[PDB]
Symmetry: C5
Subunit: 346 residues, 5 copies
């Protein structure tokens, strides 16, 4: 006899003086709530909004001496979420929620079991859209650090303390991959204790290091910006002194270079500073604009101008072509060395 | 006399000791819940978010010996959703919900009938937005496998086991078509039993094989990329040695080829690897860029340069034109053989 | 004396044995619920999602012999939605809901009146986002047929039957117009009785024939595609044998023709088959691409090439121009006859 | 003594026979509910959906003789929204809701006070997304008339009548401006009484005349369409008889004119008819396309062609240039007079 | 003994005559509620909608003499949100809500503590989407002032007065940064007392001065608009009297200048007036269009035209080139001085 749901209504009901509005160990030491999470889903990391969506299993463990049964033979008593509002629960929240919700499909997704000595496991499923500030100084090569922090709202430090457990405080699902990022295995765990004019409130947080996948931006933004500089080096071969087509190749490789420089920031926040994709576009814009300034310098030296003088201004307008045909694969190559050593090391 | 709604309140009410917070066969064998789904709607398969929306009829069948009436003459007793929170129900959920809801139009869309021996049918309507990781290595020719899995949240393996029924575990509606995909008839059914630090929980899943319709990408992305290579072969005929228009056709078929290569990935996730639509664009980019590098080689050989020597540099700059007029329909044709046999077989 | 709300609480309350969980005519003939709708709003007919939004007044009429009062002098008793969950209601739903909601502004928008013999009128306001598969074979000239179907969820055919009433089963508001479509006056009304593994369930449906307004696509997509073919016929007049500008007009009218062919499908689903707007773009793409292949054929015949021989290759390269200047207004006109007779008849 | 909340529970509670399900003046004259609104926010007037969002204070005043206290000394008794569902309220709704909601921040935003003679003031805050059909025949110069109508849902004309009050039936906030429109001060107030097959229901409505701000469309769409016609008049000066650049200026001013004609309708509904911005684009498309047909006519007359005959065809191909250089500032100016007098008067 | 939750149910329950529907100091002086906020998150400041999203901690302090306990030994009694609807609360709302919500993750995020003398602290977490009208006369250099105002809804001025506290009435989080703006430290605090036809209602508000970051618009919109003017100055060097390429550089630098002038207002509201980014685009449009009107003036003077007369029309068409090659770096530089002194001072 003695089923658990009838027995546990005796443990927390009208008799035995249990009050769900009062924390355990009242007028004594604070409640030590230890926590760990299990990340089911991760991603949709937007940058116009600067937020990310996570789907976690928030597990909470504390001790409640009023729920310590002694004569019931089992070791754990589950509690379905119909009677979930009948015991004490910590008032945990996230300091960067930006909208969140539970999951209530076919049953309230809430887990609650009570051990013999009073250890209470409390596991719920939460979908969060957490805010993290994006630092985009070196944009295709940055390592973002987006955090999540777990505060108390109504209980101060002298009544309720949050801790991480030592046995794997952040678990990650097995095949959890990201379309644009990779989640590094080392996850920092530190304190974030807040001081308001109301009091000091407990806080624990977990950093997540997000490294980008450079392989996408190496296809769309780097190679067509490297192919268009080779396209601007075709103008050094067309008719070798003067043409109406070297102007047509000098203009047109600045046009789509301006479009690709403007199209590279189509889905980005309007940040105040210069980033890594800017000084790849705004330096390769010089290598396609100096190729048209050269033909403007050739067509002014060649068409300026006797017998002796004919040997002068023709050998001077050919010296501009056959030297800058090789000098631009030296200036563009010495920048391409300097660009990647600056950013791949950082 | 004895109406069912008054009779069944005797079966589960205050008398007879029925408690909806306690599973059937308590302190005994686990509850064997068998399930099958009926897909009403399918689709809106996004790839930026990597998710799909489904609209199912979730049927659940278990046995409850406390609900086994004997003296009532009927074989089945329906139960409207007003008294739905009064019997035991399995706490099923989806491990990749990503937000979901019920349907509550004109009545809570819930079905519940109880047989004589205790068999309980439970059919509800759920709209899900399920997550599936997209593998886009061969993008217009891939066969996606998007899954859905049905776990328990509060009952472990020794208390509740999920199964698929043998009589058509996944039904599909009659005229259910997809705008971009086709749903294959063979649907895999296997186990996905999860191990956490709380316990081990039951899980059953059903795979759906989604094959794309290549007919859309054969019109927008393949034929204008095949027409623009024919457009670049017009330059082998214009004035046959030298023109200011062969540059104008050499530049311009790289411009919109760059735009079509960039516009082909307008609604795609920023994946790290190269896909099948990339190495169709980034190889046909060579066939429109080598056609301009040829005229840069023709205009350097023809305009380089006597009586005997005049026969040399004219017959040499015409040999470049009349051979590569036929060689490029050999190189582009030998790639076009190699590109489709690689991907249509896989 | 005897107010209705006090009298009707006697009619359905604890006394007289009324039970809102039991259908009328129990253990007898099925309940014949007759229905008609009033479409307030219609439209926002998307095609990427293939759905439409409607705003209806759902009226339901059935008979309930337990509500047949006799001695109260009035003919009808209204029932405000505070006591709405106290009588029986049919569990109607829509088989293609895709999310829906009620309207609860300043009062629950629900109407309920009870006649003397037991006739119960029940009118509620529902906003639906209904799904309909789009058939886009002849896209600017198609007649779409989007339906809505009204099923029962928990009551089978032997307990509850849906019917349309004979007195105008679908009413439409007076000034209801659509931005892209016109709603035809003939609305089909037929049965859609579903067979599941649970039972057979009643279903009635209403077809809505949606004919497009071709006047939008006649301005944006047809006239600039007809103007660009006239633009390609300008090249037959420029210098009459050879120019570096006939190449520039031959290239450029393929460029924006490719963009307009790609821009015409900017807000469309990725369907597997070819549609009517495709073979207007992909045939007028030939009339702007054959005009450049002609000048490539002229510049190869003119620049190929004596005294007698001079009369040959000049009269042959002029014969190509002065015949195809008139032949292309014959080939483009004989397609334009064949294109519209195929689609305006269907 | 005698606080209001204890006194008013006597006025509407179990004693005195008050029933909130029964309208005042029952079996008598209908209830005359007078209404006025206060528009806090207005705007976000979309045209793809053809709707606008408003944020109003809906005030309702009626008479309830059962709430007419006599011996309590005050003149008004406020009623907080905790007891809001305990007296009678009219079932007002909007016939063009398209989704709406209340505001429940820190308290249900509901006001309710009861005078001595029975006058009841009832003020709530509603956010509406109201539908209005857009008439876009003269699109940048139209005066839109978007309405809002307030019906009853359960009470017919012989039980409940809506009226506007004479003392400012529509108030507008002080600094309420709009980004694209201006709200005219004259607001029409008329009746909209509906007839259904259920009965006839009361309805009152208020028209809002919305005049556009033409200053935006005068910058983006009119001046670059007027600058590009001046750009097409540059071709009458370049080399004065024949050039390969007059073709290049003739083609290119049709290209971006086609893009600006297509880009002007980027965020507009797909209406069946022609509008005012169309016949500014589709007439200035002629003035940039006839300028290229002129050079095609010049290059056919000049290059057609003796001593006497040389004076003929040179003075004939120059007569085309020097007359149409001045005739096009006469034809484009006589249309520009005719265009604005047609639309600014209407 | 005497736990707080049992003691406080005596303080506000059935005994002691406490009524939560009645404000403190009834029939006396008004309730002086003092407020201060803590901005957690700020931003997503849209301009098409003209709104911003804030995430605040709304603290409210007032005095309630009915809650002034005397014999309980503690100084403050917390109150969890399960009993939150049992005492009096001010009916605060925001006059520009535009939709808002609470936060209910793992507990209702509400704080409530009661001191000994009756001081009641009440702190809740609210997410707001507040409306502010944008003034965009000088668009990249403006200082926006977006406000938030806190009114009462049901209590007039003679019953409830809102105030700001003197001890830091608006606190901001530590590392709160914005992607496009910076939040100035001086925050104005003034009154906004409203007068309706119902009464006069209290209101307090806080101004937030938002200054833009000009560094984004200095990269995308200013440098490619300054590079294209240098690109138009290349045409003064190409062949120095006449070319078919100076037309090709005169047309093309107007094309993308028109696109950049249209693309700069891609995500902006359709305002009626001219802004700062307009008269940078619409003046640099003149410097790229007058460079083509010069070559049309050169090609008409040079190609107009003896021995003496040959020296006239060649020295006249070269005087146009060599003077306007230096005059345009004087006119564009004297505007660039006048443009920034006008706007950076304001
Ligand atoms: C929750 O965790 C905190 C911190 O782990 C516990 O506080 C600690 O409690 C112990 C025993 O009450 C304290 O030790 C005591 O130290 C004092 C000198 O400070 C001395 O009288 C004894 O040596 C005694 O052992 C310890 O100082 C204290 N630490 C802190 C930081 O407060 C708390 O007891 C835990 N509460 C529960 C309910 O488990
Ligand atoms: C739910 O399904 C499971 C699996 O089908 C059932 O468990 C099975 O129960 C039977 C009978 O209790 C077990 O057979 C027994 O085998 C043992 C040796 O293992 C031996 O003493 C007898 O031969 C006896 O027949 C069977 O092993 C067991 N299988 C597993 C995997 O546990 C369970 O009974 C079902 N529960 C209900 C309520 O239907
Ligand atoms: C709801 O509507 C259905 C169909 O209109 C009604 O069913 C019909 O009921 C009548 C009278 O009970 C049946 O007529 C009977 O026919 C049998 C032979 O079939 C014979 O014994 C008599 O001639 C008798 O009149 C009729 O067959 C039956 N039709 C069907 C398709 O079932 C039903 O009665 C209606 N229920 C209510 C509550 O109005
Ligand atoms: C609500 O407003 C309506 C309309 O303003 C009121 O109806 C009006 O009531 C008066 C007095 O009952 C009627 O006057 C009567 O006219 C009849 C001839 O029609 C004659 O016997 C007398 O001369 C008498 O004065 C008036 O006709 C009637 N008007 C309409 C259109 O029905 C109604 O009484 C108001 N109800 C309340 C509760 O204020
Ligand atoms: C809430 O705050 C208001 C304003 O701070 C308080 O109103 C003020 O109350 C005091 C004392 O009742 C008034 O002083 C009195 O002035 C009159 C002449 O006006 C004279 O008889 C005495 O000199 C007396 O001190 C003061 O005028 C009044 N101010 C206003 C603007 O009304 C109110 O009492 C506060 N309520 C609570 C509950 O704290």
């Amino acid at each position: 006899p003695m089923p658990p749901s009838e027995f546990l209504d005796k443990l927390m009901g009208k008799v035995s003086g249990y009050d769900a509005r009062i924390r355990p160990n009242f007028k004594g030491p604070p409640v030590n709530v230890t926590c760990n999470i299990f990340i089911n889903s991760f991603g949709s990391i937007a940058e116009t909004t600067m937020d990310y969506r996570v789907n976690i299993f928030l597990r909470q463990q504390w001790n409640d001496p009023r729920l310590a049964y002694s004569e019931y033979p089992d070791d754990s008593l589950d509690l379905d979420p119909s009677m979930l509002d009948s015991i004490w629960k910590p008032d945990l929240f996230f300091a960067n929620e930006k909208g969140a919700n539970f999951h209530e499909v076919t049953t309230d997704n809430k887990l609650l079991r009570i051990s013999k000595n009073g250890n209470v496991l409390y596991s719920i499923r939460i979908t969060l859209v957490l805010a993290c500030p994006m630092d985009l100084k070196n944009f295709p090569m940055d390592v973002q650090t987006c955090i999540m922090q777990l505060e108390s709202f109504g209980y101060t430090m002298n009544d309720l303390i949050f801790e991480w457990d030592e046995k794997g405080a952040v678990q990650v699902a097995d095949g959890l991959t990201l379309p644009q990022f990779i989640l590094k295995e080392e996850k920092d765990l530190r304190y974030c204790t807040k001081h308001y004019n109301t009091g000091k409130f407990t806080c624990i947080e977990a950093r997540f290091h997000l490294e980008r996948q450079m392989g996408y931006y190496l296809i769309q933004m780097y190679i067509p910006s490297l192919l268009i500089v080779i396209l601007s080096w075709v103008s050094f071969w067309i008719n070798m002194d003067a043409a109406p087509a070297r102007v047509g190749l000098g203009i047109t490789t600045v046009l789509t270079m301006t479009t690709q420089s403007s199209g590279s920031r189509a889905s980005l926040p309007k940040v105040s500073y210069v980033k890594a994709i800017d000084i790849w576009m705004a330096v390769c814009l010089l290598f396609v604009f100096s190729a048209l300034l050269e033909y403007a310098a050739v067509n002014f030296i060649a068409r300026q101008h006797v017998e002796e003088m004919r040997k002068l201004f023709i050998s001077r307008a050919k010296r501009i072509d056959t030297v800058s045909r090789v000098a631009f694969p030296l200036v563009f190559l010495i920048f391409n060395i300097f660009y990647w050593i600056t950013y791949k090391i950082i």
